[PDB]
Design goal:
- The structure is cut from a larger assembly and holds five copies of chain A, two copies of chain B, one copy of chain C and one copy of chain H.
- By secondary structure, chain A is of the alpha+beta class.
- Chain A has one domain: Hypothetical Protein Ta0175, Chain: A, domain 2, CATH 3.90.1070.20.
- Helix content of chain A is about 20%, strand content about 30%.
- In chain A, the strands form two sheets. A five-stranded mixed beta sheet of chain A has the order 2-4-3-6-5, covered by helices on one side. Chain A has a two-stranded antiparallel ribbon with strand order 1-7.
- In chain A, strand 3 (about 40-45) and strand 4 (about 45-50) form a beta hairpin.
- Chain A starts with a strand and ends with a strand.
- Chain B is α+β, with helices and mostly antiparallel strands.
- In chain B, about 35% of the residues lie in helices and about 15% in strands.
- In chain B, a hairpin with a 3-residue loop joins strand 3 (about 90) and strand 4 (about 95).
- Chain B is elongated.
- Chain C is mainly α.
- Chain C has one domain (about 1-195): Cyclin A, domain 1 (Orthogonal Bundle), CATH 1.10.472.170.
- Helices cover about 40% and strands about 10% of the residues of chain C.
- In chain C, strands 1-2-3 form a three-stranded antiparallel beta sheet, with no helix packed on it.
- The two termini of chain C are about 35 Å apart.
- Classes of the chains: A alpha+beta, B alpha+beta, C mainly alpha, H mainly alpha.
- Chains in contact: A-D, B-C, B-D, B-F, B-G, B-I, C-D, C-F, C-G, D-E, E-H, F-H, F-I, G-I.
- The structure holds magnesium ion (2 copies) and zinc ion (2 copies).
- One magnesium ion binds next to loops of chain I.
- One magnesium ion (MG) binds near residues 31, 32 and 33 of chain I.
- Chain H: This is DNA-directed RNA polymerases I, II, and III subunit RPABC5.
- Chain H: It is found in: Nucleus, Nucleolus.
- Chain H: It comes from Saccharomyces cerevisiae (strain ATCC 204508 / S288c).
Amino acid sequence: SLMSCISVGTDPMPIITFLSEWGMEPLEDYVPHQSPDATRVFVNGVWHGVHRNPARLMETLRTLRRKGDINPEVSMIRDIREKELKIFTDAGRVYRPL
Amino acid sequence: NEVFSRPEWMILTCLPVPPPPVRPSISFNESQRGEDDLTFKLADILKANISLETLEHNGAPHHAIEEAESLLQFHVATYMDNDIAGQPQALQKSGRPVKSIRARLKGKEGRIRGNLMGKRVDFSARTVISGDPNLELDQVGVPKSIAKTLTYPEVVTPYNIDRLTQLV
Amino acid sequence: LTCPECKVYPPKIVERFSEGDVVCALCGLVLSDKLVDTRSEWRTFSNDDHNGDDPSRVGEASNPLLDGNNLSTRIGKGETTDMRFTKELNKAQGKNVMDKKDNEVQAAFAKITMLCDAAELPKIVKDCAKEAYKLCHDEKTLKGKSMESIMAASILIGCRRAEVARTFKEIQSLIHVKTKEFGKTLNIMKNIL
Amino acid sequence: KGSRFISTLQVKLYGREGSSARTIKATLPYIKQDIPIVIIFRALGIIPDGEILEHICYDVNDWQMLEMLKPCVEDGFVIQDRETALDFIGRRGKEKRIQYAKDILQKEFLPHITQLEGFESRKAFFLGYMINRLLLCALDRKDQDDRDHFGKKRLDLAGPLLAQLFKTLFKKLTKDIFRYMQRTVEEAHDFNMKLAINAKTITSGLKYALATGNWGEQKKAMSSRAGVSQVLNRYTYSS
Amino acid sequence: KYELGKVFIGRLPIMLRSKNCYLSEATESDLYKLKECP
Amino acid sequence: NQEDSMIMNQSSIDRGLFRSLFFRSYMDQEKKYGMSITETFEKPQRTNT
Amino acid sequence: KKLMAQIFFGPTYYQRLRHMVDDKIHARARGPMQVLTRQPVEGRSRDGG
Amino acid sequence: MIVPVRCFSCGKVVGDKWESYLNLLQEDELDEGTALSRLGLKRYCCRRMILTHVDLIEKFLRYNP
Amino acid sequence: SLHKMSMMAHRVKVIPYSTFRLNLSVTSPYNADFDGDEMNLHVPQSEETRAELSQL
Ligand SMILES: [Mg+2]
Ligand SMILES: [Mg+2]
Ligand SMILES: [Zn+2]
Ligand SMILES: [Zn+2]
């Protein structure tokens, strides 16, 4: 389509760094019987960890992306129903401006 | 059948070598020569055969012979049908798999469907179609160029004799 | 061909390709009815087909002048293939590799091919160097000349003909050249017609 | 990023609805048969049922999903420690097989996570998430994913396509330089740089693909996809 | 273990109008001179 | 003009309506086939060609 | 004389496409043949049947 | 690609009205409907003629040899 | 050529212009439209074959 374009690919590494500095409990020491509702965080299909307050983190991410600070090419989705928060740095993704 | 098809003849021993019209050659420009895939495949059968012959003639090392045998078995097999299940394919340097005898007869475009059941022909023409409310139902309008290329071989009889002379 | 009907020394005969006949221009008699498109015929040996889909592509080209008469077919992995047989059959081909001292000297071509690509030289230069070498290597006129310098001399012989400019000092550095030796070997070959 | 070790893992749920003992198995690479979930978890150091269950099911009150997993525990009953589990997986390819199992799981199992070491805990958690997701569609809680959702689709452009080609072409050169290193060390002939690096490898290599359209090597141009790279339409500006 | 340049590897084909291309930073009047269509 | 065809103004055709330029490019290589053989651009003579 | 009906008349952007009759017209009554099958050749270009 | 001499449909000589047209638009600053009319282009066939011309010649002239 | 009426024998009318001209009532069996469609002609070479054409 006219407005359409494709992703070229970003380094997920700095986004992963912001995550652990925004309250992300790492998967390695997650206890499911203790936090059975904690929202799971994904970066390019890699389960990096878990998050207690997902809404605030999401807000911080979006306002970082609209600022330019985090690439506007990067995908950021919260699945309130499935208690999931996936992110994509991935190239090949077709996007349009809104 | 005792006369035309015995079980023993399902095993090959003597190989019919097809004449060139079956497997054509083209001598281009003295450093460029084109040989048919079947000719390549026969050169492999022969090379393999010549080798096994020497092996059996000389000191037969058993396992070294059965090795050479299965290679001859392949080249022979692979020449009739190259698209064998399980087996690797005979390949022409380009990566192109060898057009076996089976391959040639095989599909729609194959010797049967594409060359016998159907065939391009002479004394045929094709152009765009347009409607003519002034033409008759049974009539077909023919562009002069086509009419001037397409022909009828009328035989000289004392009826057409004078008219045919005029056309000539 | 020549027209039976007339027969004047220079036979003025035309190829009416579109009408598919070989005709005598002088009398009008068609001498042949069967006529082939050579260019389209050649396209069954050399083509766009690498895939092996084309029912037209039925043959393969060769270079008699260089390859000689060696018709061979790779045993390779197809759509359905158990790797076991591909190994077995190729292992078998190895034992059957008992090729002559000159059927192993085609490895000197593999050297020139590796030397041309390294010299950033064209395909035509190789086919000329591999040509001049194939004609002089067995020569008595050359005898016991430094074998390393004989093939390097054929690379300059190939470059001279293909108009691809290369200095003696360039080819000298490319392999290793004993100046007087590779100047003498380049003259016996140049003398070889 | 880099090489793209495109390996697939399938976690299959056996038995149709209304059938006795519905087991859950997994497609581990370079292994003949599919292995029961509990055997993989036990091969990852998660040995009691209570732990193997925790990684899969987060709610202790989800008896519906827990009863769904009861025959998986029963199926992997025979295995009861890392060694027994690893040797089990290996035989499906002693000591020879334990190492094979250790390697397949570390190297070829969920390699998008990590290709090495201490991330067993991480690899194992993902396995549980996969099974959780599998069991959800099987309990008709969540529905089968749309195989046509454009968001789960990617478009490989000029960059990725060349990158793919160049990766194979560079590896071709790198291994031809190694072959030369042996030749020159054998005769101490001095490793002439021009004699080592064959320009033509990459030069003509890329030129082929771009010219013919068969995205791969000429070898090879039979098994490689053609259609990438076409002669540009110059009919009308819009075309 | 104890101790005892820039080499050409190949020709990469450039995409017209890319950073590496001659026509990337080219003007209208420039392209016309290069016999290229703006 | 029935069944998808159409009447066109011949007089407009003359006044230049829907005319087009057509350019076809023919290409030929003077090839070298090894040490001695070379294709040649010239006017071939019917007696020796 | 006036047409009894009134016509919907006015401008409309029309495109002259490829495919012109003289690029398509094709006749043959014998011509070149194939060497393998000895049947006619394929293509208008090649003067095939 | 140069102003056609004569309207395809009707035949009114239209090729002499170009520079004159462009003068009414730029120099006089009149709108197209007003401009084409000053030139004498009554019928829509002749109007379509000048109104729709794209003078590509000008783009071509920009290449030196 | 989907049914016997996709191939019918016709009476020639050598005419100007590069197209095969036909009557419209004949469009129905051929499944023809004058939107750039092409058709084929085959010339019988025998007095016998032309009877098969004209007769059947
Ligand atoms: Mg139709
Ligand atoms: Mg219709
Ligand atoms: Zn004569
Ligand atoms: Zn007008």
